[PDB]
Design a protein around this motif. Structure first.
Motif, PDB file in Angstrom:
ATOM      1  N   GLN A  14      27.723   2.354  -5.060  1.00 22.01           N
ATOM      2  CA  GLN A  14      27.842   3.664  -5.689  1.00 22.01           C
ATOM      3  C   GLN A  14      28.219   3.536  -7.159  1.00 22.01           C
ATOM      4  N   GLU A  37      25.090   2.377  -9.097  1.00 19.38           N
ATOM      5  CA  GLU A  37      24.196   3.518  -9.262  1.00 19.38           C
ATOM      6  C   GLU A  37      24.726   4.472 -10.322  1.00 19.38           C
ATOM      7  N   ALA A  38      26.036   4.727 -10.305  1.00 13.66           N
ATOM      8  CA  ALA A  38      26.642   5.609 -11.292  1.00 13.66           C
ATOM      9  C   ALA A  38      26.474   5.061 -12.701  1.00 13.66           C
ATOM     10  N   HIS A  83      22.744   5.365 -13.766  1.00 11.29           N
ATOM     11  CA  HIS A  83      22.354   6.750 -13.998  1.00 11.29           C
ATOM     12  C   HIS A  83      23.040   7.327 -15.229  1.00 11.29           C
ATOM     13  N   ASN A  84      24.290   6.938 -15.483  1.00 10.51           N
ATOM     14  CA  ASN A  84      24.990   7.434 -16.660  1.00 10.51           C
ATOM     15  C   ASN A  84      24.392   6.869 -17.938  1.00 10.51           C
ATOM     16  N   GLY A 114      17.040   8.476  -9.180  1.00 14.51           N
ATOM     17  CA  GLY A 114      16.589   9.789  -8.769  1.00 14.51           C
ATOM     18  C   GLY A 114      15.670   9.790  -7.566  1.00 14.51           C
ATOM     19  N   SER A 126      18.442  12.779 -11.669  1.00 17.67           N
ATOM     20  CA  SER A 126      19.554  12.714 -10.734  1.00 17.67           C
ATOM     21  C   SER A 126      19.231  13.540  -9.499  1.00 17.67           C
ATOM     22  N   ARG A 127      19.523  12.980  -8.337  1.00 19.82           N
ATOM     23  CA  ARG A 127      19.298  13.603  -7.044  1.00 19.82           C
ATOM     24  C   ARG A 127      20.552  14.340  -6.592  1.00 19.82           C
ATOM     25  N   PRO A 128      20.444  15.213  -5.583  1.00 22.13           N
ATOM     26  CA  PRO A 128      21.604  16.027  -5.191  1.00 22.13           C
ATOM     27  C   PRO A 128      22.809  15.184  -4.800  1.00 22.13           C
ATOM     28  N   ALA A 129      23.988  15.684  -5.162  1.00 21.13           N
ATOM     29  CA  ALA A 129      25.234  14.970  -4.921  1.00 21.13           C
ATOM     30  C   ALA A 129      25.583  14.959  -3.439  1.00 21.13           C
ATOM     31  N   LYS A 130      26.259  13.894  -3.009  1.00 16.47           N
ATOM     32  CA  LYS A 130      26.700  13.759  -1.630  1.00 16.47           C
ATOM     33  C   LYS A 130      28.209  13.634  -1.476  1.00 16.47           C
ATOM     34  N   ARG A 131      28.970  13.628  -2.567  1.00 11.10           N
ATOM     35  CA  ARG A 131      30.416  13.487  -2.497  1.00 11.10           C
ATOM     36  C   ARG A 131      31.036  14.141  -3.727  1.00 11.10           C
ATOM     37  N   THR A 170      30.772  12.370  -7.281  1.00 15.91           N
ATOM     38  CA  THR A 170      29.453  12.604  -7.854  1.00 15.91           C
ATOM     39  C   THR A 170      29.351  14.010  -8.428  1.00 15.91           C
ATOM     40  N   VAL A 190      31.328  14.148 -11.767  1.00 16.99           N
ATOM     41  CA  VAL A 190      30.623  13.454 -12.838  1.00 16.99           C
ATOM     42  C   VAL A 190      29.375  14.225 -13.247  1.00 16.99           C
ATOM     43  N   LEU A 191      28.684  14.850 -12.292  1.00 14.05           N
ATOM     44  CA  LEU A 191      27.516  15.655 -12.628  1.00 14.05           C
ATOM     45  C   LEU A 191      27.901  16.903 -13.407  1.00 14.05           C
ATOM     46  N   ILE A 236      28.329  15.667 -16.850  1.00 13.50           N
ATOM     47  CA  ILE A 236      27.012  15.396 -17.420  1.00 13.50           C
ATOM     48  C   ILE A 236      26.338  16.692 -17.850  1.00 13.50           C
TER      49      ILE A 236
HETATM   50  C1  LIG Z   1      28.770   9.001  -8.662  1.00 12.77           C
HETATM   51  C2  LIG Z   1      27.702   9.248  -9.692  1.00 12.77           C
HETATM   52  C3  LIG Z   1      26.407   9.563  -9.315  1.00 12.77           C
HETATM   53  N1  LIG Z   1      25.488   9.771 -10.260  1.00 12.77           N
HETATM   54  C4  LIG Z   1      24.115  10.110  -9.890  1.00 12.77           C
HETATM   55  C5  LIG Z   1      23.446   8.974  -9.139  1.00 12.77           C
HETATM   56  C6  LIG Z   1      22.647   9.651  -8.041  1.00 12.77           C
HETATM   57  O1  LIG Z   1      21.249   9.505  -8.298  1.00 12.77           O
HETATM   58  C7  LIG Z   1      23.033  11.118  -8.078  1.00 12.77           C
HETATM   59  C8  LIG Z   1      23.509  11.567  -6.709  1.00 12.77           C
HETATM   60  O2  LIG Z   1      24.105  10.442  -6.074  1.00 12.77           O
HETATM   61  P1  LIG Z   1      24.680  10.544  -4.579  1.00 12.77           P
HETATM   62  O3  LIG Z   1      24.200  11.793  -3.885  1.00 12.77           O
HETATM   63  O4  LIG Z   1      26.186  10.489  -4.592  1.00 12.77           O
HETATM   64  O5  LIG Z   1      24.099   9.208  -3.904  1.00 12.77           O
HETATM   65  P2  LIG Z   1      22.981   9.242  -2.749  1.00 12.77           P
HETATM   66  O6  LIG Z   1      22.066  10.431  -2.881  1.00 12.77           O
HETATM   67  O7  LIG Z   1      22.174   7.966  -2.769  1.00 12.77           O
HETATM   68  O8  LIG Z   1      23.870   9.319  -1.413  1.00 12.77           O
HETATM   69  P3  LIG Z   1      23.745   8.173  -0.298  1.00 12.77           P
HETATM   70  O9  LIG Z   1      24.259   6.882  -0.882  1.00 12.77           O
HETATM   71  O10 LIG Z   1      24.571   8.548   0.908  1.00 12.77           O
HETATM   72  O11 LIG Z   1      22.301   8.007   0.106  1.00 12.77           O
HETATM   73  O12 LIG Z   1      24.100  11.239  -9.018  1.00 12.77           O
HETATM   74  C9  LIG Z   1      25.818   9.678 -11.628  1.00 12.77           C
HETATM   75  O13 LIG Z   1      24.932   9.882 -12.483  1.00 12.77           O
HETATM   76  N2  LIG Z   1      27.057   9.377 -12.029  1.00 12.77           N
HETATM   77  C10 LIG Z   1      28.020   9.157 -11.134  1.00 12.77           C
HETATM   78  O14 LIG Z   1      29.177   8.871 -11.505  1.00 12.77           O
END
Ligand SMILES: Cc1cn([C@H]2C[C@H](O)[C@@H](COP(=O)(O)OP(=O)(O)OP(=O)(O)O)O2)c(=O)[nH]c1=O
Ligand SMILES: Nc1nc2c(ncn2[C@@H]2O[C@H](COP(=O)(O)OP(=O)(O)OP(=O)(O)O)[C@@H](O)[C@H]2O)c(=O)[nH]1
Ligand SMILES: Cc1cn([C@H]2C[C@H](O)[C@@H](COP(=O)(O)OP(=O)(O)OP(=O)(O)O)O2)c(=O)[nH]c1=O
Ligand SMILES: [Mg+2]
Ligand SMILES: [Mg+2]
Ligand SMILES: [Zn+2]
Lengths: 550, 651
Positions: free
Chosen positions: A171, A174-175, A178-179, A222, B107-112, B115, B118-119, B122
């Protein structure tokens, strides 16, 4: 089209004419206006800004930071460590006009993997009251995830903690990706020039960081889209990750697989003769900071004439590119090859002197800046900047960066002016080697004369591909082979329109890498097998930096 | 020519004052932007190359005549050519539920919850890169509520994987509150459940803390316009929303860094009766916690949803959303609630542009008319003319902003604006820009009701009536302009930071020093009793209360409080109570904090010399200039620094 981009465009259009006046010397301005010297980042010249840096992230991550009113405590997790890395890169990108790099991404992010694992085991202890204190400092092999089907006992708790650590690292990676690929922080295009180097950390935590960053890159951002930033670079070391017996060979193979699809990471050959450091010990925890780190902008800062041979906390002060194709076109009128070469070398001597004086004058302008003007760079990030009062000059520490003398279009400098180009002829190869060696020798003389760090640069094409060619075509018409492509061939590179195999291209381009101490790249356009072959030919012929695209 | 040479020399001197980093009227215009930094220097160069361009090419002859004559102050002139809009309230739910593709960043939908936080950061940064004003998140608790539940379910499924139990009933089971409790004396299923909560709360404590840090960091550094951030919370009577609010308040109270005051984000408490104000309400305890935090960190500020002008008839306490009909403030002072051709909602809309009116010059121009009735009639004629000029300027800027294509603001015009989802990247924003508001401002009312026309409204009754009728005339004129130009005009109590001393300088140059109006380097803030007048907080509230109903484009009730009364949290409750009684909308309690630059130790005394923790050479002062907190006293305008030096505590 965005308001921020428009604001930066207005600022550049009001700064470049200003720096052209009252700041550039008469000779310097004459050279710039005559299409001889391109002063890179002529905007941001009034800001006294430096170009680039390799961030020492240990300082920020262990002591926090206090930039202005923004204060962060020391990190306690991978989730906060990645965000602090992003914050450092973004903050220093607004203080400098070039790239930001993390020299040791695997070394900097690795204690916090263990701290996250300790948090997981302590959470399992408070859930179970089992006093799992023997699992705090235990040596982990690779931080791998297993199905946990039939692993009852303390084995179940240990494997569950490892699984949670792996998920947290995934995670966090990925963060980070993506950032750095999404946050539009700097001015104009607003995307931060971010690079990270990894590959030489053999510990389980560094291996986990590398594995998860490679998996995150492989999965994309994404919906499977390839990430543009950060520019990932794989550090290639024989005995660490290159040979099949090496510790990080498997990850290296994984890296190749990623490069087969996402075309990242790039490869930095630490085995090159110019990239070797006598103070690299395989056991020392600080064996980084004695190894070469590179940026996506191909800036190489390794050797220092009055300090340590290191890349961390150092960077480029400023670099300017020299138009040698223009000089070759000017000397094209001489029928005798010897006299034509002598005339070209005299012109190159004069232009090199002008460029050295320009870089020195910009250095004298930059050195009067106070530490208060760079809240993060001149407080945690530069070499020796921790001993700087906010209201004192940076002259005591600025004499550690590199002054770059760049060049472009060597192949175009030779295609028709003095014969053929180095891709197709051996005489042209010898001539190009002679030209670059002359540039390097004059750079050493300039370093002695001006008491600075001058280095020859294979300037990246971005921002300069057509600026020289348009004016050269306007002045001299369409010279067959020289001014007929709408873009100059990249420095000491075989022209793209010349069809040669990767072996021939590598053989031709290898010698120039040793001469271009300020930066170089090998570029292959085209399965992990081909990436393995590219790295193998980078190893066989001494080459510093390499990349494969499509 | 000599004039051309002089102009070139002036431009060179202005462009070198920025380079040399000296305290000037151009390098201290905005106290959030750091002019020493390269990004600050670039922004200052852009401002200096843009303001003359808009003055000489984009404005009209009447607008230029007003501006050069010290009658009208157009706000954010540097961003005029960019067609940027001022502010918006983030509809964070769509971003968090579907993701977003801005530039090359997808960026895909948040799951926690982490996230989601941080979104949110952003989204605020991205929209700040596309606009020239403050960024605010309404319904912060409502928008972050579902992800607390999602994190709880993730923790439950992790425990289920570890243990192999059947925790399916602990997925959508009701939870009274997310309170962390020690696991001392409970075993089995119950313990497991509590453990999940004790983790979920922790996962919410970092996510909020990170937020408070990120908005205090991505604002401390800015390559583009600085990130002016604010959030609104207080009306989510659910376990997840209460958890979000409690963690935000706790993190703000603890501080940022080494226990320092977070300058940003500006926090706003949405006070409303029946939900969080009365003791029998659900979130009264969180309101008391907010008052406690405001005692120390000066946050959150309090917004009165019970004010007659902030009431919506579509608000149902049982409605799941329930937040689309609640009012939120952009932090500094902006208020965007009503809509003449849409729904009464602050969500996904905000201010377009605003311009301030110098009523002080109009009043002082009528100095020789010895008859008060004729003097007031002349003053009102001048006010009407200048109001027409200001409305023309706002409509001109609106017509310029309309032509902006949707791709100029990628995130704002695809996810953040009302109806922006039904647009192509190339189409213009004409079909959606009309939901914004146009603000008409004023300054120096206290220094407008003075020796020219008597004595100021803080010490006279007919002076108060005169000020009230002036503001009422402006409000009625704004309503007429709204009906005429087919827009949403509103009177705004404009904040006074760069305009604190800009009119008074030219008035001193032209008219001179008149005792009570131009004898100070600043103009008293709009419809505020003088900061140099010894008045009680109750009297100030009584005087300034009726103006809030008139100034519906934005208002604030400031209460300066002494260091001794800083500790006590009941004084802030008294301020909120007097806001509730006298139909006031927005308020804030202020106090000066002595902070060590090296350490960050912020004392609460009136004046401090050295840091008790370390012993630093000098201690800086922290306070709120006009609508936001500013770190060091050396970032203030001299005009506004004079106002700060002459501030009087109300307690
Ligand atoms: C935590 C975090 C996520 N993100 C982005 C990355 C992801 O593409 C998007 C949503 O991430 P998540 O929904 O948290 O990850 P996920 O969809 O893969 O969930 P899972 O692992 O259970 O399958 O947000 C950031 O840009 N910065 C951050 O600090
Ligand atoms: N984005 C952004 N906007 C700001 C900031 N500070 C002030 N503003 C804008 O300023 C408005 C408040 O009025 P003031 O700040 O007093 O305006 P001013 O001081 O006269 O400054 P100018 O009008 O631009 O000359 C708000 O509505 C914001 O839109 C900031 O730090 N960032
Ligand atoms: C997670 C996170 C932290 N930070 C900052 C806030 C913290 O001061 C610093 C380190 O974060 P933490 O790891 O949370 O440090 P902490 O003191 O809160 O540790 P603990 O929770 O165990 O008590 O980094 C960010 O700026 N952004 C982020 O996203
Ligand atoms: Mg994920
Ligand atoms: Mg924490
Ligand atoms: Zn101190």
């Amino acid at each position: 089209d965005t308001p921020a981009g428009m604001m930066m465009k207005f600022a550049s259009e009001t700064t470049k004419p200003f720096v052209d006046d009252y700041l550039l010397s008469e000779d310097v301005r004459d050279a710039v206006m005559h299409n001889y010297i391109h002063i890179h980042d002529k905007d941001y010249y009034p800001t006294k800004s430096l170009t680039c840096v390799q961030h020492p992230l240990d300082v920020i991550l262990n002591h926090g930071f206090t930039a202005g009113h923004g204060s962060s405590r020391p990190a306690k997790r991978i989730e906060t460590a990645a965000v602090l890395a992003c914050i450092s890169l973004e903050t220093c990108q607004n203080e400098m006009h070039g790239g930001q790099a993390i020299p040791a991404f695997d070394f900097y992010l690795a204690p916090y993997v263990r701290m996250s694992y300790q948090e997981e085991v302590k959470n399992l202890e408070k859930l179970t009251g089992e006093d799992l204190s023997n699992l705090y400092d235990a040596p982990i092999d690779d931080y791998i995830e297993k199905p946990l089907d039939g692993l009852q006992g303390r084995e179940r708790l240990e494997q569950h903690a490892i699984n949670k650590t792996v998920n947290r690292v995934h995670q966090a990676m990925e963060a980070f990706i993506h950032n750095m690929n999404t946050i539009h922080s700097r001015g104009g295009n607003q995307v931060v020039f971010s690079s990270i180097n990894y590959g030489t950390d053999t510990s389980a935590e560094g291996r986990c960081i590398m594995r998860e960053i490679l998996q995150s890159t492989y999965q994309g951002v994404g919906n499977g889209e390839t990430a543009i930033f950060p520019i990932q670079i794989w550090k290639k070391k024989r005995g660490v990750n290159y040979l099949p017996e090496d510790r990080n060979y498997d990850l290296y193979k994984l890296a190749c697989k990623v490069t087969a699809r996402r075309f990242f990471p790039n490869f930095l050959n630490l085995d090159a003769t110019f990239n070797q450091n006598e103070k690299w010990r395989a056991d020392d925890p600080e064996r980084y900071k004695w190894e070469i780190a590179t940026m996506g902008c191909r800036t190489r800062v390794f050797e220092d004439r009055w300090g340590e041979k290191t890349s961390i906390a150092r960077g480029n002060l400023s670099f300017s590119t020299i138009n040698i194709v223009k000089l070759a076109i000017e000397c094209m009128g001489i029928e005798n090859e010897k006299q034509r070469i002598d005339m070209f070398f005299a012109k190159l001597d004069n232009i090199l002197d002008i460029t050295a004086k320009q870089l020195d004058e910009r250095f004298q302008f930059q050195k009067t800046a106070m530490a208060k003007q760079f809240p993060l760079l001149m407080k945690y990030l530069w070499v020796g900047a921790e001993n700087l009062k906010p209201e004192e000059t940076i002259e005591s520490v600025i004499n550690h960066g590199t002054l770059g003398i760049g060049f472009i279009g060597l192949a175009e400098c030779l295609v028709a002016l003095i014969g053929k180009h180095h891709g197709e002829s051996e005489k042209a190869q010898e001539l190009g080697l002679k030209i670059i060696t002359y540039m390097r020798d004059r750079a050493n003389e300039f370093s002695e004369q001006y008491h600075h760090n001058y280095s020859i640069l294979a300037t990246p094409a971005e921002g300069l591909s057509g600026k020289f060619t348009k004016k050269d075509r306007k002045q001299f018409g369409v010279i067959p082979g020289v001014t007929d492509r709408d873009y100059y061939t990249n420095s000491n590179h075989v022209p793209v329109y010349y069809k040669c195999t990767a072996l021939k291209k590598a053989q031709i381009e290898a010698p120039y890498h040793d001469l271009t101490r300020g930066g170089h790249i090998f570029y292959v356009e085209i399965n992990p097998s081909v990436i393995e072959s590219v790295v193998d030919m980078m190893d066989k012929y001494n080459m510093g930096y390499g990349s494969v695209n499509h």
